[PDB]
Amino acid sequence: MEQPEPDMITIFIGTWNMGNAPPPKKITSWFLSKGQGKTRDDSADYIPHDIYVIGTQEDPLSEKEWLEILKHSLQEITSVTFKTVAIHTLWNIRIVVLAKPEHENRISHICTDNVKTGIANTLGNKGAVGVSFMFNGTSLGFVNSHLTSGSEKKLRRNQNYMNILRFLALGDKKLSPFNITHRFTHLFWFGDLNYRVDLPTWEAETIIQKIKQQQYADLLSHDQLLTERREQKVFLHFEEEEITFAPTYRFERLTRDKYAYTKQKATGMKYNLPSWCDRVLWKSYPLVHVVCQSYGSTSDIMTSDHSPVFATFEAGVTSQFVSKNGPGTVDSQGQIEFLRCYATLKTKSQTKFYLEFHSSCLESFVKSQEGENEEGSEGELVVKFGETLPKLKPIISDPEYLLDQHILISIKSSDSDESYGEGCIALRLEATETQLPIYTPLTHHGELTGHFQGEIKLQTSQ
Numbered sequence: 001m002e003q004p005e006p007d008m009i010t011i012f013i014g015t016w017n018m019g020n021a022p023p024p025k026k027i028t029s030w031f032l033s034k035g036q037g038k039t040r041d042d043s044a045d046y047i048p049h050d051i052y053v054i055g056t057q058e059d060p061l062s063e064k065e066w067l068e069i070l071k072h073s074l075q076e077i078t079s080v081t082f083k084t085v086a087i088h089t090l091w092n093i094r095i096v097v098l099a100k101p102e103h104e105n106r107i108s109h110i111c112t113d114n115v116k117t118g119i120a121n122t123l124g125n126k127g128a129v130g131v132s133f134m135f136n137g138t139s140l141g142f143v144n145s146h147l148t149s150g151s152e153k154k155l156r157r158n159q160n161y162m163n164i165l166r167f168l169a170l171g172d173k174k175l176s177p178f179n180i181t182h183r184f185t186h187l188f189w190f191g192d193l194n195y196r197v198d199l200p201t202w203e204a205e206t207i208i209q210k211i212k213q214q215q216y217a218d219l220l221s222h223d224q225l226l227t228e229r230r231e232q233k234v235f236l237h238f239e240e241e242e243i244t245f246a247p248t249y250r251f252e253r254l255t256r257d258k259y260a261y262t263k264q265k266a267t268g269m270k271y272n273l274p275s276w277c278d279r280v281l282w283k284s285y286p287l288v289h290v291v292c293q294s295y296g297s298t299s300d301i302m303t304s305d306h307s308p309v310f311a312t313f314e315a316g317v318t319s320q321f322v323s324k325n326g327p328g329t330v331d332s333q334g335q336i337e338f339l340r341c342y343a344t345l346k347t348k349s350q351t352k353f354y355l356e357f358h359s360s361c362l363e364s365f366v367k368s369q370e371g372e373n374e375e376g377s378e379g380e381l382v383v384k385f386g387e388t389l390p391k392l393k394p395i396i397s398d399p400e401y402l403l404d405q406h407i408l409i410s411i412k413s414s415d416s417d418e419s420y421g422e423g424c425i426a427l428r429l430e431a432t433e434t435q436l437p438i439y440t441p442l443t444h445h446g447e448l449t450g451h452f453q454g455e456i457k458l459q460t461s462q
């Protein structure tokens with residue numbers, strides 16, 4: 001007898017800047033999503049999440065010490081002894097992934113990496129750690145970043161973000177044109193992102209009184225991460241749940257009754273106005289199920305100048321599909337065709353371009369012919385592929401497999417073979433054997449570089 005394979009799992013994400021102090025004896029409220037914000041229902045307390053991903057910053061513990069605390073905490077809550085999937089530490093920045101023991105044979109292709117962000121001076125305590133793995137047919141990635149501190153350094157934080165997403169090496173290395181923002185079905189990025197509430201320092205007491213009233217609107221309108229995202233300066237194409245918990249920084253230790261904001265020698269004579277430093281964001285491939293179930297902060301863990309943050313997700317997953325044909329051959333009953341396709345690029349360059357199509361549903365990636373460059377009406381380069389793109393041959397034709405897949409697209413220069421833009425198309429279509437519009441934005445280094453649009457026609461065995 002075998003259990004069915006899951007269609008959905010739940011994932012816990014935690015981020016906590018520990019302020020170089022040991023944790024208190026009990027930290028279960030964190031893993032229970034209890035405290036302020038969007039919290040988890042009490043009736044779920046004994047129900048284990050499938051995967052727990054724990055990001056720390058300013059973590060003073062050894063890996064062994066922290067693992068023991070984490071496993072004990074989850075055992076107490078759930079009566080389950082979790083398996084360690086991965087642990088990786090850079091300086092005092094750490095990521096731990098734990099999973100239910102039933103998932104040990106569902107998890108494979110485990111990767112870890114780190115990125116150090118500074119230059120000389122600025123190099124040596126900020127950066128990121130990450131973990132990726134496959135869960136059956138679904139790729140999962142997780143990034144814990146500790147970005148540059150200081151209210152006046154939002155630009156440096158955005159630069160840290162770009163370095164991390166360029167240089168963190170996770171997932172399938174065959175996806176060579178793609179950075180981490182395209183390599184995973186579900187990507188979770190969290191940490192002490194260190195974006196601040198940008199209000200005058202003389203408004204400190206006003207801010208605290210707003211917090212005490214649980215009136216966050218006029219504060220969130222000045223949150224640097226929200227404003228930079230709105231201006232497409234950082235975290236393009238990521239999501240974040242609405243914030244309904246108090247700022248998680250900077251507290252006096254051993255209570256939560258007081259924000260410590262005034263400039264001190266220990267802060268480099270900087271103010272630390274109350275801010276949402278500690279965040280969880282995500283990006284999933286188009287038309288995959290992902291729902292945030294909790295996003296909040298604990299109220300009873302007081303050893304640090306930050307409060308822990310939790311977020312939980314229901315995430316769609318797929319099985320490791322086997323047919324009589326693929327893997328190991330094509331299924332001639334399946335095809336993917338593209339009509340009337342063109343890329344619009346922001347480049348000022350005039351080279352020829354071709355496409356690469358990458359997907360787990362193909363034996364290997366497919367390179368197209370060169371498109372035909374035209375100039376658009378408002379200055380743009382338009383690369384026309386017409387009806388010229390190849391017919392893609394998936395390994396499996398069953399619609400229960402193929403409609404759950406995605407095609408990554410890179411548009412590459414013929415001259416340099418470098419990608420000018422990356423994007424993703426879902427095969428979760430409204431119809432098969434029917435021409436339907438497709439669209440993706442194209443990015444490079446996580447910044448918008450163009451668009452790809454056209455029509456698709458998918459043939460399955462039904």
Ligand SMILES: *C(=N)c1nnc(-c2ccccc2)s1
Nearest residue numbers: 109110111112170171172173
């Ligand atoms: C990370 N260290 C990895 N290197 N290759 C990986 C991979 C291969 C196939 C499918 C997914 C991931 S993971």
